Amino acid sequence: LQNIIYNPVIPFVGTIPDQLDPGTLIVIRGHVPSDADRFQVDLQNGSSMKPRADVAFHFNPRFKRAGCIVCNTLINEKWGREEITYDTPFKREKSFEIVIMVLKDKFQVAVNGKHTLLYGHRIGPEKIDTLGIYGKVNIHSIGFSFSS
Ligand SMILES: O=c1c2ccccc2c(-c2ccc(Br)cc2)nn1CO[C@@H]1C=CO[C@H](CO)[C@@H]1O
Ligand SMILES: [Cl-]
């Protein structure tokens, strides 16, 4: 595991230094502030703002009501079909560790050691070169364990 950054200012946008081949792990440690409505981790094809970079995997915990996680893909500035997970491990004022495991056909995400969700690839993961973190969240570290 090689961290590309510790204690980043949010929003954070950084280049991923190698390809997300099957078997790659992405590890993100952080904490949800007590007033958060949402945050997201986006695996992107570049960092353009105008027009907005494609988002292969948008991982979006939301804290209203019972809480949920929304996952989606942005292609050519259009969102696709939301996949919503209602069994969410995130909570306001609680710390987490996210592990994203890149498989051949999907991502598999676990939080605090416990399986959270799966998300099938809609953009080839080879096209991902950038990681962004947005919203109301405190991040301790972002790192990669590359299968290369
Ligand atoms: O709600 C936000 C948001 C909130 C705080 C900070 C950033 C954002 C951003 C945002 C915009 C550009 C860039 Br670059 C990075 C983040 N988008 N949305 C909007 O998020 C969407 C709203 C509804 O559903 C979509 C998923 O289906 C998505 O969550
Ligand atoms: Cl697979």
Author numbering: 8 to 155
What does the study report here?
pmcGalectin-8 is a soluble galactose-binding lectin involved in cell–cell and cell–matrix signaling. The galectin-8 structure contains two different galectin carbohydrate recognition domains (CRDs), both β-sandwich domains of around 130 amino acids, connected via a linker of variable length (most commonly 32 amino acid residues). Of the two galectin-8 CRDs, the N-terminal CRD has a higher affinity for its natural ligands. Inside the cell, galectin-8N detects exposed glycans on ruptured vesicles to initiate antibacterial autophagy, and in a linked process, galectin-8C interacts in a protein–protein interaction with autophagy receptor NDP52.5 On the cell surface and in the extracellular matrix, it can interact with glycans of glycoproteins and engage in protein–protein interactions to initiate or enhance a wide range of signals.
